[PDB]
Amino acid sequence: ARSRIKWAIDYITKYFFTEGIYLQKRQREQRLLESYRAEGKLGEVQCRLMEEPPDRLHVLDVGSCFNPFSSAPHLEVTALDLCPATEDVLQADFLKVEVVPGIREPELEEGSVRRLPASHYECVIFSLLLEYMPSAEQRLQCCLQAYDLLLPEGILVLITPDLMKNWRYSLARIGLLRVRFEKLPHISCMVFRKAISRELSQHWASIHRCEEIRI
Amino acid sequence: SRIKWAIDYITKYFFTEGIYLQKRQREQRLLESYRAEGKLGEVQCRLMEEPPDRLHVLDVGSCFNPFSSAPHLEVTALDLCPATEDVLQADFLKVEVVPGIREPELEEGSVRRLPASHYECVIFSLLLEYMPSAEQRLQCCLQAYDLLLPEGILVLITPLMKNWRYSLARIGLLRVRFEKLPHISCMVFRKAISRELSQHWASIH
Ligand SMILES: C[S@@+](CC[C@H](N)C(=O)[O-])C[C@H]1O[C@@H](n2cnc3c(N)ncnc32)[C@H](O)[C@@H]1O
Ligand SMILES: C[S@@+](CC[C@H](N)C(=O)[O-])C[C@H]1O[C@@H](n2cnc3c(N)ncnc32)[C@H](O)[C@@H]1O
Numbered sequence A: 001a002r003s004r005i006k007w008a009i010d011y012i013t014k015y016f017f018t019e020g021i022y023l024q025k026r027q028r029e030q031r032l033l034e035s036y037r038a039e040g041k042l043g044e045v046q047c048r049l050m051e052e053p054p055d056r057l058h059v060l061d062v063g064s065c066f067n068p069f070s071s072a073p074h075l076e077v078t079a080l081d082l083c084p085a086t087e088d089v090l091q092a093d094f095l096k097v098e099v100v101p102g103i104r105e106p107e108l109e110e111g112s113v114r115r116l117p118a119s120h121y122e123c124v125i126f127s128l129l130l131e132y133m134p135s136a137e138q139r140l141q142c143c144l145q146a147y148d149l150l151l152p153e154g155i156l157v158l159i160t161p162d163l164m165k166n167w168r169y170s171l172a173r174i175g176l177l178r179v180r181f182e183k184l185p186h187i188s189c190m191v192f193r194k195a196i197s198r199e200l201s202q203h204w205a206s207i208h209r210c211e212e213i214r215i
Numbered sequence B: 001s002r003i004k005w006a007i008d009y010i011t012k013y014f015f016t017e018g019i020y021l022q023k024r025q026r027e028q029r030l031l032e033s034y035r036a037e038g039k040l041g042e043v044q045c046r047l048m049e050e051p052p053d054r055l056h057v058l059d060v061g062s063c064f065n066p067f068s069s070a071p072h073l074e075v076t077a078l079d080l081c082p083a084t085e086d087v088l089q090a091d092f093l094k095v096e097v098v099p100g101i102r103e104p105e106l107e108e109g110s111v112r113r114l115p116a117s118h119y120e121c122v123i124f125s126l127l128l129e130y131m132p133s134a135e136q137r138l139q140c141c142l143q144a145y146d147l148l149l150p151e152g153i154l155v156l157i158t159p160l161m162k163n164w165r166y167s168l169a170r171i172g173l174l175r176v177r178f179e180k181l182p183h184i185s186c187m188v189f190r191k192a193i194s195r196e197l198s199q200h201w202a203s204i205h
Helices: A004-018 A021-038 A136-149 A164-172 A198-207 B002-016 B019-036 B134-147 B161-169 B195-204
Strands: A057-062 A075-081 A098-100 A107-109 A112-117 A121-127 A150-161 A176-184 A187-194 B055-060 B073-079 B096-098 B105-107 B110-115 B119-125 B148-158 B173-181 B184-191
Touching: A004 A021, A004 A057, A004 A121, A004 A150, A004 A176, A004 A187, A021 A150, A021 A176, A021 A198, A057 A136, A098 A136, A121 A136, A136 A150, A164 A176, A164 A187, A164 A198, A176 A198, B002 B019, B002 B055, B002 B119, B002 B148, B002 B173, B002 B184, B019 B148, B019 B173, B019 B195, B055 B134, B096 B134, B110 B134, B119 B134, B134 B148, B134 B173, B161 B173, B161 B184, B161 B195, B173 B195
Parallel strands: A057 A075, A057 A121, A098 A112, A121 A150, B055 B073, B055 B119, B096 B110, B119 B148
Antiparallel strands: A107 A112, A150 A187, A176 A187, B105 B110, B148 B184, B173 B184
């Protein structure tokens, strides 16, 4: 049985470096936009693309007990947790974090992370986190902040314990298109991409229809 | 419910329906129309960037912070007599909209300064009647305008509404939505691309 931590490091390496899945998904999303445009249902939209990935990806791991991903090569990880188990993990309630443009590092007040940089992370990781959230409204809030935190074409890694088609509609409704789904032992591993255009992903969701993340 | 009505509209204005981009088109149509009549020329037109997935909402008169539950809404809740702990204490009339700052600056537990052009939405839900003077009612509405980003919306729930449109248009706010709910009147006013455009519309209206 393979680890979710290895599965995620493997995809992030394929998506940005070894296989360039960020470029394959870009070419597709551009094709869907041309198609929608030619059916008259979308038209002009804003498109933002990612530059060549850096040699060190900025990864945000929210709900990290330990820092599983810190040692991975080419991953500069910022680890946040409500009840950290290791000292390298920052204390934070993600639900109470502001996504601030114009900054780069977490800003802490009274030991807790209160502010994170917007459009800064090539990857945000929610490994077995959303299930703790009290309501479905707060699960979608976590995903919405992640979207604000991701760079264009960045990826949100979502690992849930043992509706996905709703999680796919609900996330495309906010600008996140799924790019991978695999069933590992006792867990479902997903990746959602920050599409080149939110309007495009939102349109895909409209055609493919609950607007929250339930359990 | 007025809280469900507002959350629904804000989502349609910024995300689901793009009313902010439709009302932009409507206002650039009206400006080029004035310009054709020589009643307005080149003018300062300010547009909004693509709204974040988490919007900055200011709830003035927030008694218990009902909007902090909306997923799209990061709410900074103010109230002269907070009924909940998540709500900051403040007398909006004694608060200054300050350009440069980025967060609310408090003094002795009361909010005294707020960031200008920082919020996509400001909410006056049944507040402007608990204000004494009609010049303080406008002061609230004038600080909302300064707190709002280009093309942001001011939600206004009320317990003449034509003279209300004109008075708010004179300060740069043109209405975009109106619906009657049980016992209240729900309104939304947008910060037009140009204040001079909005003021022009009010003079003609
Ligand atoms: C699945 S477990 C531990 C992480 C797991 N080893 C993984 O693969 O990421 C749940 C984690 O989510 C954290 N958590 C729950 N709510 C949180 C919140 N509001 N902000 C940050 N972390 C939170 C818990 O503290 C806990 O560390
Ligand atoms: C009828 S309540 C509206 C509360 C909430 N918006 C709602 O939907 O029920 C009037 C609110 O405006 C507040 N208020 C009155 N004057 C204020 C002022 N000068 N600054 C801030 N809040 C004020 C009151 O404390 C009260 O919470």
